[PDB]
Amino acid sequence: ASETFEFQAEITQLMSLIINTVYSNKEIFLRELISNASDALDKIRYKSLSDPKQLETEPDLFIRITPKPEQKVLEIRDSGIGMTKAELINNLGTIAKSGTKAFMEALSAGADVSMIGQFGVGFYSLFLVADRVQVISKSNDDEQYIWESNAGGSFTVTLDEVNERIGRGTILRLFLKDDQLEYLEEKRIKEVIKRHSEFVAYPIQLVVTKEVE
Amino acid sequence: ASETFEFQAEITQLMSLIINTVYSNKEIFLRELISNASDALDKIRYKSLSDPKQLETEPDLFIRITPKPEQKVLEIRDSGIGMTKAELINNLGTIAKSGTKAFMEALSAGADVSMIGQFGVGFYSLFLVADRVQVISKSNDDEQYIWESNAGGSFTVTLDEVNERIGRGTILRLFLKDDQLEYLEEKRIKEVIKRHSEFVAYPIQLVVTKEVE
Ligand SMILES: Nc1ncnc2c1ncn2[C@@H]1O[C@H](COP(=O)(O)OP(=O)(O)O)[C@@H](O)[C@H]1O
Ligand SMILES: Nc1ncnc2c1ncn2[C@@H]1O[C@H](COP(=O)(O)OP(=O)(O)O)[C@@H](O)[C@H]1O
């Protein structure tokens, strides 16, 4: 059974603002999610300095992007620290985020939407290209859980009994908007990645599917 | 909870014979599994002639090969008819297979191991390159289940609560032997596929993972 939680009011406002904005540089969402992925990998690496066993659940440290055309889904995965059930509820919704209102006010003043990451709310930039998202996470400290949101005022968290097992890490499963399907294309994904992410310490793997000739 | 079943005696013998054989043309396993995949796709397509709704669980008809290096696993997937729990138990183990003893006798006489498919036991050719296998299947008529074998005399069947959801079809998850890791390599997989499978009516998709430069 899934559990439902209410988003902190300002986060709901931010999501409404982002999913509805006609901003032109929507591709910035990838830079933000890749940055969050890198941060998660930094955390597990750092924790492992004094607790090496933490790495054993998934020795490979990577960022992986997997387009799923049929389902019109784009997945951004990392083998970082991951999030326990409590962290998913805490970090992605119920607790007030310092930069939320600040960013919205900056936006009103004319600030570029690309500043979202500097305000600490880059995760929500995903709503620039997706109308729904499932965050699948496995922290060494908990079971695998699924957090899901459609930019509405509430989200759900469910023990994961339906997705592939993640050794450790997080998968941002984006259900792309009908007019943003270009982010399923290899060429497009490649140019966006090369553009705003040259100094990422981890390999960024793109999963490509080709018909054998 | 998993359930354990005993293999029909002759199948156990066949598996022992195959996993231990020093045969040189081990690559034939791919041709056999791709053939079984094509057959499964033929079945759902045919059934759909009088029951079109059967296709809706997964409209795309394909064969997909996905190497998973870290886990030393190679997956062969199809969106065919799939197998219900009863079919997995029935079709892959507990029931006597007509060609089992016949093939073993042919083998003793000098027959090429590649004849395995003509005897109707091509599925077991997978033990030429793997010491363990999980068959994940989803038939429109049942839930998703996992059948698992290590070539021993018994196998297990478990309701699937750990793998990605298959719309419909089957995944042969092969845990490759340490000296057969060449089948994780794109170039190698490509040449084997092009060699013994030119007349397959369905697209054969290879999932490749590359680091973004
Ligand atoms: N890939 C991830 N792995 C682990 N935690 C994440 C991931 N993405 C987001 N989070 C968590 O949820 C929070 C919300 O994301 P975000 O608004 O972008 O925060 P921040 O700007 O501090 O990265 C993060 O602070 C982080 O704790
Ligand atoms: N990919 C698959 N999809 C559905 N059923 C399969 C698949 N692979 C094997 N089977 C089933 O298990 C049986 C055992 O496989 P195999 O020995 O190769 O049989 P056959 O030679 O008749 O294909 C098959 O007859 C078939 O019913």
UniProtKB/Swiss-Prot annotation, chains A, B:
Effect of residue 100 to I: Causes a 90% reduction in ATPase activity and a reduced client protein activation activity, leading to growth defect at high temperatures
Annotated binding of ATP, by residue: 32, 36, 78, 83, 91, 97-99, 118-123, 170
Superkingdom of this protein's organism: Eukaryota
Transmembrane segments: none
Description of its domains: The TPR repeat-binding motif mediates interaction with TPR repeat-containing proteins like the co-chaperones AHA1, CDC37, CNS1, CPR6, CPR7, HCH1, SBA1, SSE1 and STI1. CNS1, CPR6, CPR7 and STI1.
Stated family: Belongs to the heat shock protein 90 family.
Assembly, per entry: Homodimer. Interacts with the co-chaperones AHA1, CDC37, CNS1, CPR6, CPR7, HCH1, SBA1, SSE1 and STI1. CNS1, CPR6, CPR7 and STI1. Interacts directly with the substrates GCN2, HAP1 and STE11.
Further comment found in the protein's record: Present with 444943 molecules/cell in log phase SD medium.
Record's protein name: ATP-dependent molecular chaperone HSP82
Organism of origin: Saccharomyces cerevisiae (strain ATCC 204508 / S288c)
Taxonomic placement: Eukaryota, Fungi, Dikarya, Ascomycota, Saccharomycotina
Residues of the full protein shown: 2 to 214 of 709
